């Protein structure tokens, strides 16, 4: 298939001790600007880092001077980490990520719901919920008898389900006058034409 | 830093005693896959992604090895300064709209070290996700729970006693 290549952790020369590594790849305009940053963490403290924007291992603390001044010597280690900007970042973006995450699209499931029981002419609150979508760009606008209502509208923050689907709930403070038609109008990059789901008075 | 997409590739985590490990691959917040270390098997969050791409768990196993190494040398280097514990917090929310007669997710943050245990007031059993990396080098972890009608218990060293979020 296609190739998910991880970076190569360069190596060093009742209690608990924690150590952590990661290779961050910051893409903008696809691959028109890649920034590679590599971080080493002992006990919640980042002590060494290779930041592509520098081009060398710089120490973040006194514990870092040994490993940074060390790894900068042997280029079998440096030039490899330096070029991980293509062997990991660029390669991974242009390769498996295209065949997967940069290709995931799931259209939202949109459902209006009247939280307090309907009592016409009494004030109530409509809840347009929008569930199960990817990526996270989405815009949810409310209409009271075909006119955008921004007043009395409160959306949540974006909600990471963590299984590659988001969630947003949008509240409308409103009041059922009979014959009125509220519509939840949802716009998403997985939608050829915007979604409109209606609730009749 | 400011960007459009952010791959968090090759996350290695180790901690002794007990040599606990984790090797993971994030891309925009969600987890692509981990490597099961005991099964020596790459386990994709999304199975569909598994059919569309591949990762060789040996790279994860080597990297975790290097990390056990570095952890040992560094544990020495500091006169053996131990890890500071961290109070964790949870928030529970449902994945789809919950309609009486139709998944419940628990979201714990400020986890550190990476050892939490996740729980009608009786024992029940779920999917748990590998730990996710924060900017402050603690972690957050998520636990799902699959019929509503008329909680979350967390046990940690930063907790004097445990806590539950009803």
């Amino acid at each position: 298939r296609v190739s998910y290549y991880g970076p190569k952790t360069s190596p060093v020369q009742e209690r608990h001790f924690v150590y952590q590594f990661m290779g961050e790849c910051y893409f903008t305009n696809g691959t028109q600007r890649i920034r590679y940053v590599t971080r080493y963490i002992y006990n919640r403290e980042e002590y060494v880092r290779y930041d592509s924007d520098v081009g060398e291992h710089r120490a973040v603390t006194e514990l870092g001077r040994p490993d940074a001044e060390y790894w900068n010597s042997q280029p079998e280690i440096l030039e490899r980490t330096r070029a991980e900007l293509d062997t990991v970042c660029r390669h991974n973006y242009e390769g498996p990520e295209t065949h997967t995450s940069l290709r995931r699209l799931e259209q939202p499931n949109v459902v209006i719901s009247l939280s307090r029981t309907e009592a016409l002419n009494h004030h109530n609150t409509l809840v347009c919920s929008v569930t199960d979508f990817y990526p996270a760009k989405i815009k949810v606008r409310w209409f009271r008898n075909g006119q955008e209502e921004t007043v009395g509208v409160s959306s949540t923050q974006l909600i990471r389900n963590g299984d590659w689907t988001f969630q947003v709930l949008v509240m409308l403070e409103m009041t059922p006058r009979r014959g009125e038609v509220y519509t939840c109008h949802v716009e998403h990059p997985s939608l050829k034409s915007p979604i409109t789901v209606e609730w009749r008075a | 830093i400011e960007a459009d997409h952010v791959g968090t590739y090759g996350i290695s985590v180790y901690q002794s005693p007990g040599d606990i490990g984790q090797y993971t691959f994030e891309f925009d917040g969600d987890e692509l896959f981990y490597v099961d270390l005991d099964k020596k098997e790459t386990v994709w969050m999304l199975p569909e992604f598994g059919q569309l791409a591949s990762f060789d768990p040996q790279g994860g196993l080597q990297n975790i090895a290097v990390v056990k190494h570095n952890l040992g040398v560094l544990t020495k280097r500091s006169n053996s300064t131990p890890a500071t514990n961290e109070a964790p917090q949870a928030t529970v929310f449902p994945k789809s709209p919950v309609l009486l007669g139709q998944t419940l997710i628990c979201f714990v943050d400020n986890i550190f070290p990476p050892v939490i245990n996740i729980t009608n007031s009786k024992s029940v059993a779920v999917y748990e996700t590998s730990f996710f990396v924060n900017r402050d080098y603690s972690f957050h972890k998520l636990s799902y729970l699959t019929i509503p009608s008329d909680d979350c218990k967390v046990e940690h060293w930063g907790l004097e006693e445990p806590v539950l979020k009803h």
Partner: T-cell receptor, first 113, second 111 residues
Framework: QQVRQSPQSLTVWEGETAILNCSYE??????FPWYQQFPGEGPALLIA?????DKKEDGRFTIFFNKREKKLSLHITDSQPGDSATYFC?????????????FGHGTILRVHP | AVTQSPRNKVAVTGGKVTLSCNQT?????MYWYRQDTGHGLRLIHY???????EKGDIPDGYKASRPSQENFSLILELATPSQTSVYFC???????????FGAGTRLSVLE
């Protein structure tokens, strides 16, 4: 995946040019070491090339690498009899951070004094 | 360097046989191949560091053990004639680009 070395053994007269061949299937491969083994002994790295370059020349030996057709060729010139060995051709996808090395089956060399 | 041990062994079918390897290179990775004509070098077991072992392409019959950074070891728990061969041991560095082999062990499993 597999790596195939031809011919399974080769015989060359002193001073002639040994030409040892190798072909790998997996295009992910980017490191190509050649290990030489002398009877009674473990094998040891003779000469390696990486896919970026098309030839590493080390005095008497030269690797020729073809990325397109996925083909190698090790040239020994003016071969002395101390070159009569078995030559193995390896490849690894280094990005794979495997550890594992994939070893071709080996050509067996006879240098005719 | 890499000294394997013993370099010649003769043992019966059904009896335990323990090769051994010592590596003075401050290396981290160790490997146990066997060489056969027509099937070349084939990897059986390997190890990233003390305590872990990983299964190579032919782990059937042999169990490995890494109790030291210097010491890998094979174990033919129940020997079989099909196991008779020239066994080899190697080691290398993390992300290292060279395999440092041992000299050899000639093993004869006999009925």
């Amino acid at each position: 995946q597999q790596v195939r070395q031809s011919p399974q053994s080769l015989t060359v007269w002193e001073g002639e040019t040994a030409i040892l061949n190798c072909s790998y299937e997996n295009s992910a491969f980017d490191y190509f070491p050649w290990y030489q083994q002398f009877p009674g002994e473990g094998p040891a790295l003779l000469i390696a090339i990486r896919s970026v370059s098309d030839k590493k020349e080390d005095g008497r030996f030269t690797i020729f690498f073809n990325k397109r057709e996925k083909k190698l060729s090790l040239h020994i010139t003016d071969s002395q009899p101390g070159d009569s060995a078995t030559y193995f051709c390896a490849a690894s996808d280094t990005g794979a951070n495997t550890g594992k090395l994939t070893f071709g089956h080996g050509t067996i060399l006879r240098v005719h004094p | 360097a890499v000294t394997q041990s013993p370099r010649n062994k003769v043992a019966v079918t059904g009896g335990k046989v323990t090769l051994s390897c010592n590596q003075t290179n401050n290396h981290n990775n160790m490997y146990w191949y066997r060489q056969d004509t027509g099937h070349g070098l084939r990897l059986i077991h390997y190890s990233y560091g003390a305590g872990s072992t990983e299964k190579g392409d032919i782990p059937d019959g042999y169990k490995a053990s890494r109790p030291s950074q210097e010491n890998f070891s094979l174990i033919l728990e129940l020997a079989t004639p099909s196991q008779t061969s020239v066994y080899f041991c190697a080691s290398g560095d993390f992300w290292g680009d060279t395999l440092y082999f041992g000299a050899g062990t000639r093993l004869s499993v006999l009925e």
